[PDB]
Amino acid sequence: SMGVFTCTLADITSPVAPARLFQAFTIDNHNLMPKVVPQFVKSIDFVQGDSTAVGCVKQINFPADAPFTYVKNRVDEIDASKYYLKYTCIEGDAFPDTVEYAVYEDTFEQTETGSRCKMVAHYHLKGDSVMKEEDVAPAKEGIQKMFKAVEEHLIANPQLYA
C-alpha cells in the first residue's frame, strides 16, 4: 500500500542462554507466559494446531488493563537451530491504528555475554498512514518488562529448558 515500516520492537542482551530464551518466548510461551507474566498475558490458546509448529495459530489474550484485547499469530517459519521464528498477525486489535498487515521475527543470537534477543516488526501501512515513535513505545516498554520477568524466572530455574 503506502509502504512497509520495519522497526525493532525489542533488542535485549541477556546472560541467559539463547536456546532457553527461544523455548520460553517462541516454543513454550503458551504455557510459560500466562503463569509467569499474568499482568501482560491473560491466556494463550491454540486456534490451529496443538503444539508450536509451522502453520499453527496461537491467540494471545491480553488483560482488561491492556489497550487491545487479542492477536492471532500464524507461525510461518521456524529455524530452531538459529533460534528464529517468523509469524504473521492474521487477526486482532493490537495494531497501531494505521497498519494493514504485520509480520514479526523473533531471533535469539549467541553472544559472549549470553544471548542477544531481537524482535522485529514489519508493518505494512495503509495510504498515508502516519507513524511515530509514540505509536510503538507502549509495545516496546511492555515487551522489555515481560522479558525482564521471564529472564528472572529462567535465572531462578536454571534447569528449565536447559
Author numbering: 0 to 161
Paper text:
Here, we isolated a salt-induced PR-10 gene from the halophyte Halostachys caspica and named it HcPR10. Like the structures of other PR-10 proteins (Aglas et al., 2020; Morris et al., 2021), HcPR10 was composed of a seven-stranded β-sheet (β1-β7), two closely connected V-shaped α-helices (α1-α2) between β1 and β2, a long C-terminal α-helix (α3) and eight loops (L1-L8) connecting these structural elements. HcPR10 formed a pinecone-shaped structure, with the twisted seven-stranded β-sheet and the long C-terminal helix forming the top surface of this structure and the curved V-shaped helices forming the bottom.
The cavity also contained several hydrophilic residues, allowing water molecules to bind inside the cavity in the apo-form structure. The cavity had a volume of ~1,339 Å3 and contained one entrance located at the surface close to the top of the pinecone-shaped structure.
